[PDB]
Design a protein around this ligand. Structure first.
Ligand SMILES: O=C(Nc1cc(S(=O)(=O)Nc2ccc(OC(F)(F)F)cc2)ccc1Cl)c1cc(F)cc(F)c1
Ligand SMILES: O=C(Nc1cc(S(=O)(=O)Nc2ccc(OC(F)(F)F)cc2)ccc1Cl)c1cc(F)cc(F)c1
Lengths: 540, 540
């Protein structure tokens, strides 16, 4: 009842004297290890597997046996482990190996349980739940297998911000699937029917949000991996009534904005002198641009309309302008050029000719349509600025606008680069360069830990902008001198504690915080936040 | 506390009504399956992995979650699953992937715990223990990683004979290792020292046997995978004082003997007309020959000395005779030819010239030294008998004296073949042939179930000979007409119940049985044995 409890089990870290006292002498091999030694052993066990999915499989079995050792291993090898325990391995595990999630505590909803959502939550037997990750499996369709996405995401809040692993709930809202293989698969365990229409979808998701605010009143609700037809609408429906956010939309823009403002500082080319091609004009790409404007307005008090005019949006038609003669979608209107002639708009269609005309100092890659930041385009940006900022942010790694290596080569080390995925360093004439990864892990854990402590009535856009600024300000003079746009990913606990502290102070300034126990001054609150965090060490 | 208990967990086999009553509605995807459907799903999950070791890894995680479903899957796919859940996959898992055994309940002994063996057994918290598999990791050296061999073997008693999975204990006696990689491996968790000398070895193994006979008085002790320097000596030390047997020695000879006597019936060439080359003359090979003689004497009441003269033993020097002029090891003397001249012995060195001289009707491959049953040798056996019996029994599959395919081809379908490993069928002129696998699973489970029910004071050689005869007599007229030497492996529960019944009746005839509750007549006892067996079905 010690060994079989994954929360108190220590395996070989039980001293001989503990083994005797606990009457488990002879249930373990004789070597006594420290946690650090166990982690090094587990690390070698992981690298004994070649395929990511088999590495993940090993780590799931570590989590089932000794949960402390699982988190200790992830934190000691975070950069290397991240692509294994979340994107892109996790989607492939959900799609083909969904059995790897069967043993993980989670909650399955569907229309069959309509009206009983609250009783299912009560029966799940949770104490003071702090974070809930919900998906529908729809940003191929995984349907019910989307539970794996919620599981993987919950685990990053535990690793990243020390959310206690017993106070986090992964949730699948199964509203059906349009995945035709699943609909015909004898082994699919979900609702075998096409996705429900919006009316029934919102009836079930409304019951979910009401039931959770009642049974899990202390929880942050985070939407993960919802398709475009619903993710924006979901936040508009719930942002004010419940304590919720969407990491794909709000986390991404918060992280990119923080890294982008640090790239502006290293460029010496100040924010109002920037000329920014935003390659890709979906709602998310436009959200990222707005988040950059909002952070620059907060950090530097330039008029936001002056920041908005640094942006040149490119959709599939070309430069978005008011004179190009089409009916612009609402999200594109605010960043539309007003200073470009109909005649010039007609000659502003390919990225090459847009770059030649605009003379940008920055390229933001949000296009999702492969490697458009050509050698020729990068060479042009080099005649407008001594430090081109190039952000190939499209995932997966195949969709990326340019490789950091190509960016560094073509600019002979002058490009300031942030990526969506990890990349190895590139060395040019004895000088080393490495892109700064804009990982979402920098923001969501801190937001979840801040909202878990402050208990705000809701998560207004101010708390996300605060987290964005906090992340920006954590990049030290030393980090900046070495070309880093973000604090180091390995220091995620310190990053999360700082982001959480600043999110709390913001909720206090807005008087939406419901926890009166917290300190209200930054130094004392930061110290308090750090002590509240769950640590993967053997405590008792 | 339902889902997390692998003994009562049913997963998707919980009906909706059970889920509601058990307050686990919403802890599972919505599909309700029968056990049979779960097994077919698990089977497809297994075949999603290419490597045996990754298949085993998946099955270990099935056992951890839903133990009923694990055993249901093995029994539905026994022939295919056996090479994955025991030899040869299990040795490779122990050697390189020993972490796959960490979550399995077992007991580790070593010299550090000297004098406390009994308290470790008490503390392990077992009820009426029926079977104990012990190894030292020495038949490469795995040392402590040998625990995986005990684990794999315990699981075959549960699958094969319905030993209740809560009443079986896997044991490693770690007396050190001579594996030099392990002695230098930072991740080895065993005693980091060379194997103990015989005096300290027997002090620890004597304490083991005394402690077990006291704390686990109802148990069968089975020795598994002990090296030749100790396995024979161990049985001589303990056979009369404790309830114990060695499956490598006694199980192998019992299974081979049963299959061999069935091969004699199909050959029509009766036992006293057989001429049997025994290729390989180690203690085990000579044990197999003696077990064949002993079974033929029991089943047919030929004088045993007349059976002994059907055997022609070949060691590395050639035909073992009294005239060949060397000092014969004790085990070889009893099967030594007395009817071969010194002059003929000098010309009886290669297997080819021994086969030409002896004119055997049978070749028994126990040599462990590769494919010595050549096309030329098989062609010669064809001029001495219309049905050559050819038994390439050397493991692994590389050491085998001849492929069943080659045997069937060279004899145009006349060879009667038993193998150590599974082989696919061979088709010759529209006629199908398939070797009968002499798997050890045919005997050890039945012996363990018989000795668990009868509670004999010890396991004399009569009980093994009884099990051997019982297995022989289970091969039906129909099995025999189709060329099978053994009952079908898939019917292992019925085989185990029959072997157990006959072992019990033998212990009753000898008045060594200590359980007075049992029926004493075969039909009533067989019915009773079948009802006692643990079944992998959802019971409650
Ligand atoms: O804790 C148990 N055993 C154990 C633990 C360790 S450890 O030090 O905690 N490292 C460790 C663990 C698990 C892992 O992952 C795995 F299981 F996949 F290999 C990797 C690395 C080392 C050796 C052993 Cl034998 C145990 C737990 C039970 F619920 C039941 C039971 F019978 C034994
Ligand atoms: O029993 C649980 N879940 C579950 C079981 C099944 S099943 O029907 O029992 N098939 C099944 C199981 C396990 C396996 O092996 C594995 F885990 F490796 F995939 C394969 C096949 C299907 C779906 C699910 Cl979600 C469970 C158990 C816990 F201790 C904790 C917990 F949160 C959930």
């Amino acid at each position: 009842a010690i060994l079989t409890d994954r929360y108190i089990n220590r395996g070989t870290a039980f001293t001989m004297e503990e083994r005797q006292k606990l009457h488990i002498l002879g249930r373990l091999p004789p070597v006594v290890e420290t946690l650090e030694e166990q982690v090094a052993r587990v690390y070698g066990q992981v690298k004994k597997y070649e395929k990511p999915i088999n590495r993940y499989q090993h780590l799931v079995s570590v989590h089932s046996t000794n949960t402390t050792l699982y988190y200790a291993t992830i934190l000691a090898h975070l950069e290397e482990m991240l692509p294994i325990i979340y994107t892109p391995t996790v989607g492939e595990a959900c799609m083909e190996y969904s059995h790897l999630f069967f043993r993980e505590r989670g909650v399955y909803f569907n229309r069959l349980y309509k009206g009983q959502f609250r009783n299912i939550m009560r029966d799940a037997g949770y104490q003071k739940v702090e974070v809930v990750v919900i998906t529908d499996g729809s940003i191929g369709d995984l349907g019910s297998n989307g539970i794996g996405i919620s599981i993987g995401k919950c685990s990053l809040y535990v690793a990243g911000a020390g959310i206690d692993p017993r106070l986090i709930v992964p949730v699948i809202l199964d509203v059906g699937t349009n995945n035709e293989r699943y609909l015909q698969d004898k082994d699919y365990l979900g609702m075998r029917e096409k996705r429900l229409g919006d009316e029934e979808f919102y009836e079930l998701l409304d019951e979910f949000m009401e039931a959770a605010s009642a049974e899990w009143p202390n929880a942050v609700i985070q939407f993960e991996d919802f398709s475009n037809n619903h993710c924006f609408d979901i936040m508009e429906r719930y942002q004010k009534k419940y304590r919720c956010f969407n990491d794909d939309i709000q986390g991404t823009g918060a992280v990119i904005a923080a890294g982008f403002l640090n790239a502006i500082k290293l460029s010496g080319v100040s924010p109002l002198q920037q000329r920014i091609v935003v390659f890709g004009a979906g709602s998310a790409a436009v959200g990222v641009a707005n988040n950059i404007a909002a952070l620059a307005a907060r950090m530097y008090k330039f008029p936001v309309q002056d920041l908005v005019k640094t942006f040149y949006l490119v959709d599939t038609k070309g430069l978005v302008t008011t004179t190009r003669g089409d009916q612009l979608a609402a999200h594109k209107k605010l960043l539309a050029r007003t200073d470009v002639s109909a005649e010039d708009s007609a000659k502003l269609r390919t990225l090459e000719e847009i770059v030649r005309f605009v003379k940008p100092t920055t390229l933001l890659g949000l296009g999702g349509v492969g490697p458009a930041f050509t050698e020729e385009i990068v060479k042009m940006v080099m005649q407008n600025t001594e430090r081109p900022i190039i952000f190939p942010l499209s995932n997966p790694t195949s969709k990326a606008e340019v490789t950091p290596e190509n960016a560094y080569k073509w600019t002979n080390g002058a490009a300031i680069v942030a990526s969506g995925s990890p990349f190895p360093p590139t060395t040019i004439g004895g000088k080393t360069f490495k892109p700064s990864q804009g990982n979402n892990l920098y923001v969501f854990p801190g937001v979840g830990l801040g909202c878990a402590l402050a208990q705000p009535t809701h998560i207004p856009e101010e708390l996300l902008l605060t987290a964005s600024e906090s992340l920006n300000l954590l990049t030290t003079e030393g980090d900046l001198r070495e070309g880093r746009l973000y604090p180091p990913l390995e220091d995620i606990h310190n990053i999360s504690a700082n982001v959480a502290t600043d999110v709390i102070l913001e909720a206090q300034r807005m008087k939406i915080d419901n926890n009166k126990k917290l300190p209200r001054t930054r130094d004392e609150l930061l110290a308090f936040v750090k002590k509240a965090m769950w640590k993967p060490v053997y405590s008792g």
